[PDB]
Ligand binder design. Structure first.
Ligand SMILES: CC(C)CCC[C@@H](C)[C@H]1CC[C@H]2[C@@H]3CC=C4C[C@@H](O)CC[C@]4(C)[C@H]3CC[C@]12C
Ligand SMILES: CC(C)CCC[C@@H](C)[C@H]1CC[C@H]2[C@@H]3CC=C4C[C@@H](O)CC[C@]4(C)[C@H]3CC[C@]12C
Lengths: 123, 113, 246, 33, 107, 287, 120, 29
C-alpha cells in the first residue's frame, strides 16, 4: 500500500492523498463534498492537500476519501478514519527527550565550573 | 418561551464546556459582556469555552435573524488548587520547617564565631 | 390460532400454524409485533407453495385448510408476537389473536450467585440481585406483600461477547437479607452467598490510570524547582568554605 | 495504564545526582584517614 | 464500500461480515467469534491498515481502511513567553555558581 | 409512511378528544383499530374513498370524517373508562388490488374518574458491589423508578453525555405494587453491565433518566401539592475505586510538593544574600 | 443589569439576587419550587447547607411574588465542588506565606549571629 | 512504585547523610 500522511501542528490538520499524480483530486467527508468551493475560509485545497484550520474533535471527525474528478464516489476502495485532539500551543514531548535535556544541562554546568577553576588556579 | 435560548452542554470526555444557541438560522453571532467575540456559520453550531479547570465565568448571548436573546450567567468553581488540612500535611510542613531552620542556624553559628 | 407462550432453544426449527375453517380465501400474510410497538409485515403469499425471504418460509395447504410458518437458526432477537391474517377479494381483513414466542440463549459457563448492592443514601430500600442462571431455573413471585420480585431478563454485552440472566428483589422493611430473599424459588445447590469480609484487589486498580495535561505541566514545574535548589545550595557551600578557611 | 509524562524514572534520576555526591564525599573521607 | 469502525465503552473495534486480514500496524485480539477485531484502549493511539471482503449486494468487492488516533496524552501546553522566562532563570543561576567558584579558588 | 399524533394522553370522564392520522404515499383508504388483552385488533370505522365513510365492529362513540385525501381524524364525544386502550391507524392502496397494509406507531390512552391520582416517578441508582468485581470482574448498576400513575414512561442510560444501547436490559412490562386495588401505582427497573476497569475510573459519569407524560397548562388544580406535569427525573454517580492509588491522590501529592519547594527556595536565597554581604564588608575592611 | 453574587465558606454556598429593591422573592431550581418552608430562604438570600455536586447543579432563578418564572431577567448556571478544611492556593496566598516565612526566619539568624558574637 | 512520596522521602535521607558526612569530614581535616 501507500498510506495517507496526517500532519498536526497547532490546531491545524493537513492530509495528503498519495495515489494520483496527474489528476484533479476531490475530497469528501461523511458523504458530503468538501474543499474547492470557497465557503468556509478555514477549509481550502491545493495540489493534493486539504488544510483543516481550527479543527474540532467532536464535530468534524470520521471518514475521508479522495478520487479523481470525473468519477463516482461509490467506486472508492480506500478510506481514512481519524480522531484528533488539538489545543492551541500544545506540543508533544516524550520521556526520553526530557531526560536528555536534564543530562545536557548538568554536563554544560560541569564544564563551565572546570574551566573557571583552572583559569583561577592560573592566576 | 420567554426568550431564553442559550444552554450548557456538559460532562464530555475531555473537560470542555460547550454552549448551544437555540435559534433557527444560519450564521449565528455570539457575545460576551455586550461585545462581539466570535462568528459561526453552518457545520459548527457550538461555541467552545475551553476546559473547566480554568473555570470560566461571564454573561453570554447569541442572535440569529430576529433580535438578541436574554443573557446567561455561568459560574464554575471546580477547585483544583486546594490542599486539605490533615495529619499528614501538617506533619510534613512542620518536619521540613524544623530541619531547614536547624541547618541554617548551624551555618550562621560557624560564620559568626 | 392457539395462544400461550412456547419455548424454543437457541438454533432450531420453529413451527407455527393457523386453521381457518371455513371459507375460501385468496390472500395470506404474517405480521410481527414487538413490545410496545406496531405491527410489521414479513411475507405476502397468495399462491400455494413457498415464497422464501431468507430464513423464513411459509406454506399453504388448500384442501387441508391451514397455513404454516417455519423459522430456522433462531436467536434471542425473535421474541415477539406473530399474527396471521387473510381476506377475500374485497375489503375487511380478518386477524387471529396471536402467538407469543420466547427464545432462550446458550449459557456456556454458569456461575450462580446472589449479591447485595450498595445503598443510595436518598431512598431507604435495599436490592438483592440473582445473576447468571443456566436458563432452566424458574423464578417465582413473592410470598409476602412487601417484597417485590421481577422476572428474568437477558442482557447482551458486545464488548466481550457475553450474555447472561438476571432477577432483582427489593423491599422497605427490616430483617431483610439476601440469604432469605429468593426462598420461594427453586434454587440450585452450589450458588455463592458471599461474606462481608471485603477483598479489593490492588494491581487491578492500576490498570485504569488516566492523565490530564495539567498534571504533566505540574510535574515539569517540580522538576524545575529541584534543579534551582541544588544550584543555590552549591553557591552557599562555596561561600561558607571561603569564610571558614580564613 | 497510561502514565504519559509522569513516569517515576525522572524523580529517581534527579535523586541519583545527590547519591553521586554522597559517594564522592565517602571516598575522600576514607582516602584521608 | 465502507468498513464500519465502532466504539464501545472505551475501546475500538473493526466489524465486518467476514474475517479480517492484517496489513501493517497494530495486531489486536480476536474475540470469542471471528469477524471482529479489538484494537485496545482509545487513549493508547491505535494506528494501522486493515482489509476485509464483501457479501450481500457488495459480493465480489473489496475495501481497505486505515485507522488513526491522536489522543494527546503525552502533551504539554506552553506559551512562547514562559520558555524564555525559564531559559533566563537557568542562565542566571549557572552564572551565579560560576561567580561562586573563583572566590573559593583564591582563599 | 403513516405517522400519527400524539403518543400518550390522559383525560377525565366526560371530556372530548381528537387524534390525528396522516399519510404521504397517495393511498386511498384508512382505518382505526383498538387492541386489548385477549381480544386483539377490532375495527372501528373506515373510509373507502375521499368523502365516503363506513362502520366497523365496535363503533359506539366515534365520529369520523374525510375532508382531504391524506387525513382521517377520530373524535371521542364523551370519555368513559372503557375507552382505555391502544389505537392504531392503517392504510391500503386501492381496494384489494395490492394488499400490503402499513400500520401506525400507536397511541395510548387512559381515562380516570378523578385527576387527583396522577403521580410523577422517583428515581434511584444503586452502585455495584465488591464481591462481583472480585469474583467475575464485571460490574452491574440498577435503576429503580417507583410509585407513578398513569403508566407513561420512557427510560434511558447516559454515559459521558451520550446515550448507550449496548449492555442494557429493561423490563418489558411495568409491575403493579398491590394488584388488588383499582387505581394502583406501578414500578419499573433497568440494568447496565460494564467491565471492571471502566467503573474503577473516577472520571466516567453515569446517569439514568425517566420521561413522564402527564397533565398540561389548561387544567384545574385545587390540591395542596405541586401540579404533576410532563417532566424528566434523573439520578447520577461518578465511578469510584475503593483501594489502591488513583489519579485523585497524585494531584494532592504534586500540589503539596510545589508549595514546599517554593518555601525552601526562598530560605536559601536569604542565606545567599547574608553571606554575600559578609564577604563584601570583609572586602571593604581589607582595603 | 447586575449579576448574581456567589459566596462559598466551607460547605455552605450562599447566592444572592440584587435586582429587585422592594418585593418578595421566590426561588426555583430545575423547575422545582425550592426554598421556603438543608435549604433556608432568607430575606434576600438562599442558603444551601451541606452542598453536593451531583444533586444541586443547574439552573436557578429569582422572580417577584406572583409573577411567572419564564420572564424574570436571566438564569444562573453553576457547577461547584466544595471541601471541608481546604484552603485554595492562588498566586497571592502563596506570596503571603513565602514573605511571612522569610520575615520570621530573618530574625532567628540575627539572634544566633549576635549571641555567638557576644560569646567569644 | 507510582507513589512519589517514596521518591521525595528517599532524597530526604540522602540530604541528611550528605550533611552529616561533610560535617565529620571538616572535623577531621
Ligand atoms: C535539599 C532537599 C533534600 C531539602 C528538602 C528535603 C526534605 C526535607 C523535604 C523536601 C520535599 C519534602 C516532601 C514534599 C512532599 C511531601 C508529600 C506530602 O504529602 C507529605 C510530605 C512530603 C513527603 C515532604 C516531606 C519532606 C520533604 C522530603
Ligand atoms: C535551605 C536548605 C534546604 C539548603 C541550603 C544549604 C545550606 C543552608 C547548608 C547546606 C550544607 C550545609 C553545611 C554542611 C556541613 C557543614 C559542616 C559543619 O561542621 C558546619 C555547618 C556546615 C558548613 C553546613 C552549613 C549550612 C549548609 C551550607
Amino acid at each position: 500500500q501507500t498510506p495517507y500522511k496526517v500532519s498536526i501542528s497547532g490546531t491545524t490538520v493537513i492530509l495528503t492523498c498519495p495515489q494520483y499524480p496527474g489528476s484533479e483530486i476531490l475530497w469528501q467527508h461523511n458523504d458530503k463534498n468538501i474543499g474547492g468551493d470557497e465557503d468556509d475560509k478555514n477549509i481550502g485545497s491545493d495540489e493534493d492537500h486539504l488544510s483543516l484550520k481550527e479543527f474540532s474533535e467532536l464535530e468534524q471527525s470520521g471518514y475521508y476519501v479522495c478520487y479523481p474528478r470525473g468519477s463516482k464516489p461509490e467506486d472508492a476502495n480506500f478510506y481514512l478514519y481519524l480522531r484528533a485532539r488539538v489545543c492551541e500551543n500544545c506540543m508533544e514531548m516524550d520521556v526520553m527527550s526530557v531526560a536528555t535535556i536534564v543530562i545536557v544541562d548538568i554536563c554544560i554546568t560541569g564544564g563551565l565550573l572546570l574551566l573557571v577553576y583552572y583559569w583561577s588556579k592560573n592566576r | 418561551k420567554g426568550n431564553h435560548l442559550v444552554k450548557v452542554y456538559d460532562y464530555q470526555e475531555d473537560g470542555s464546556v460547550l454552549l448551544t444557541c437555540d435559534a433557527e438560522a444560519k450564521n449565528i453571532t455570539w457575545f460576551k459582556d455586550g461585545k462581539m467575540i466570535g462568528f459561526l456559520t453552518e457545520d459548527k453550531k457550538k461555541w467552545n469555552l475551553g476546559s473547566n479547570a480554568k473555570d470560566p465565568r461571564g454573561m453570554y448571548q447569541c442572535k440569529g435573524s430576529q433580535n438578541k436573546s436574554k443573557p446567561l450567567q455561568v459560574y464554575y468553581r471546580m477547585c483544583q488548587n486546594c490542599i486539605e488540612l490533615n495529619a499528614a500535611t501538617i506533619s510534613g510542613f512542620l518536619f521540613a520547617e524544623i530541619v531547614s531552620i536547624f541547618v541554617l542556624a548551624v551555618g550562621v553559628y560557624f560564620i559568626a564565631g | 390460532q392457539d395462544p400461550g407462550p412456547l419455548s424454543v432453544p437457541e438454533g432450531a426449527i420453529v413451527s407455527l400454524n393457523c386453521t381457518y375453517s371455513n371459507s375460501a380465501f385468496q390472500y395470506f400474510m404474517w405480521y410481527r409485533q414487538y413490545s410496545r410497538k406496531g405491527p410489521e409485515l414479513l411475507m405476502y403469499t397468495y399462491s400455494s407453495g413457498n415464497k422464501e425471504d431468507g430464513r423464513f418460509t411459509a406454506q399453504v395447504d388448500k384442501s387441508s385448510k391451514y397455513i404454516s410458518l417455519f423459522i430456522r437458526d433462531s436467536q434471542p432477537s425473535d421474541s415477539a408476537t406473530y399474527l396471521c391474517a387473510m381476506s377475500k377479494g374485497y375489503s375487511t381483513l380478518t386477524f387471529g389473536k396471536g402467538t407469543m414466542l420466547l427464545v432462550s440463549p446458550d449459557i456456556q459457563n454458569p456461575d450462580p450467585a446472589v449479591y447485595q448492592l450498595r445503598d443510595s443514601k436518598s431512598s431507604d430500600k435495599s436490592v438483592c440481585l440473582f445473576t447468571d442462571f443456566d436458563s432452566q431455573t424458574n423464578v417465582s413471585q413473592s410470598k409476602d406483600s412487601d417484597v417485590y420480585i421481577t422476572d428474568k431478563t437477558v442482557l447482551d454485552m458486545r464488548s466481550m461477547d457475553f450474555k447472561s440472566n438476571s432477577a432483582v428483589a427489593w423491599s422497605n422493611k427490616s430483617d431483610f437479607a439476601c440469604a432469605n430473599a429468593f426462598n420461594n424459588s427453586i434454587i440450585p445447590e452450589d450458588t455463592f452467598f458471599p461474606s462481608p469480609e471485603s477483598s479489593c484487589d490492588v494491581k487491578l486498580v492500576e490498570k485504569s490510570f488516566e492523565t490530564d495535561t495539567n498534571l504533566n505541566f505540574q510535574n515539569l514545574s517540580v522538576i524545575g524547582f529541584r534543579i534551582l535548589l541544588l544550584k543555590v545550595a552549591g553557591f552557599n557551600l562555596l561561600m561558607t568554605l571561603r569564610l571558614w578557611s580564613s | 495504564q497510561s502514565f504519559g509524562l509522569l513516569d517515576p524514572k525522572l524523580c529517581y534520576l534527579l535523586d541519583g545526582i545527590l547519591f553521586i555526591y554522597g559517594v564522592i564525599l565517602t571516598a575522600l573521607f576514607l582516602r584521608v584517614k | 464500500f465502507k468498513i464500519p469502525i465502532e466504539e464501545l465503552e472505551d475501546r475500538v473495534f473493526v466489524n465486518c461480515n467476514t474475517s479480517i486480514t492484517w496489513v501493517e500496524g497494530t495486531v489486536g485480539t480476536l474475540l470469542s467469534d471471528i469477524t471482529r477485531l479489538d484494537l485496545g484502549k482509545r487513549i493508547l493511539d491505535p494506528r494501522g491498515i486493515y482489509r476485509c471482503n464483501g457479501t450481500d449486494i457488495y459480493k465480489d468487492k473489496e475495501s481497505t481502511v486505515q485507522v488513526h488516533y491522536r489522543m494527546c496524552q503525552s502533551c504539554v501546553e506552553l506559551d512562547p513567553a514562559t520558555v524564555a522566562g525559564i531559559i533566563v532563570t537557568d542562565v542566571i543561576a549557572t552564572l551565579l555558581l560560576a561567580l561562586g567558584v573563583f572566590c573559593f579558588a583564591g582563599h | 409512511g403513516v405517522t400519527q399524533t400524539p403518543k400518550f394522553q390522559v383525560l377525565k370522564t366526560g371530556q372530548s378528544m381528537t387524534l390525528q392520522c396522516a399519510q404521504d404515499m397517495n393511498h386511498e383508504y384508512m382505518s382505526w383499530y383498538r387492541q386489548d388483552p385477549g381480544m386483539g385488533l377490532r375495527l372501528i370505522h373506515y373510509s373507502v374513498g375521499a368523502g365516503i365513510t363506513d362502520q366497523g365492529e365496535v363503533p359506539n362513540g366515534y365520529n369520523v370524517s374525510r375532508s382531504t385525501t391524506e387525513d382521517f381524524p377520530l373524535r371521542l364525544l364523551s370519555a368513559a373508562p372503557s375507552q382505555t386502550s391502544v389505537y392504531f391507524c392503517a392504510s391500503r392502496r386501492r381496494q384489494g388490488a395490492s394488499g400490503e397494509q402499513y400500520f401506525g406507531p400507536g397511541t395510548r390512552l387512559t381515562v380516570t374518574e378523578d385527576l387527583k391520582n396522577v403521580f410523577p416517578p422517583e428515581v434511584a441508582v444503586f452502585e455495584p458491589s465488591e464481591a462481583e468485581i472480585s469474583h467475575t470482574q464485571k460490574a452491574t448498576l440498577v435503576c429503580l423508578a417507583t410509585g407513578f400513575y398513569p403508566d407513561h414512561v420512557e427510560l434511558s442510560w447516559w454515559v459521558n453525555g451520550k446515550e448507550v444501547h449496548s449492555g442494557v436490559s429493561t423490563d418489558p412490562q411495568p409491575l403493579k405494587e398491590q394488584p388488588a386495588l383499582n387505581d394502583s401505582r406501578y414500578c419499573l427497573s433497568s440494568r447496565l453491565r460494564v467491565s471492571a476497569t471502566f467503573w474503577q475510573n473516577p472520571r466516567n459519569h453515569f446517569r439514568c433518566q425517566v420521561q413522564f407524560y402527564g397533565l398540561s397548562e389548561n387544567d384545574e388544580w385545587t390540591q395542596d401539592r405541586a401540579k404533576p406535569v410532563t417532566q424528566i427525573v434523573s439520578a447520577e454517580a461518578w465511578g469510584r475505586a475503593d483501594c489502591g492509588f488513583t489519579s485523585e491522590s497524585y494531584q494532592q501529592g504534586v500540589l503539596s510538593a510545589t508549595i514546599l519547594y517554593e518555601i525552601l527556595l526562598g530560605k536559601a536565597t536569604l542565606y545567599a544574600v547574608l553571606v554575600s554581604a559578609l564577604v563584601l564588608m570583609a572586602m571593604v575592611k581589607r582595603k
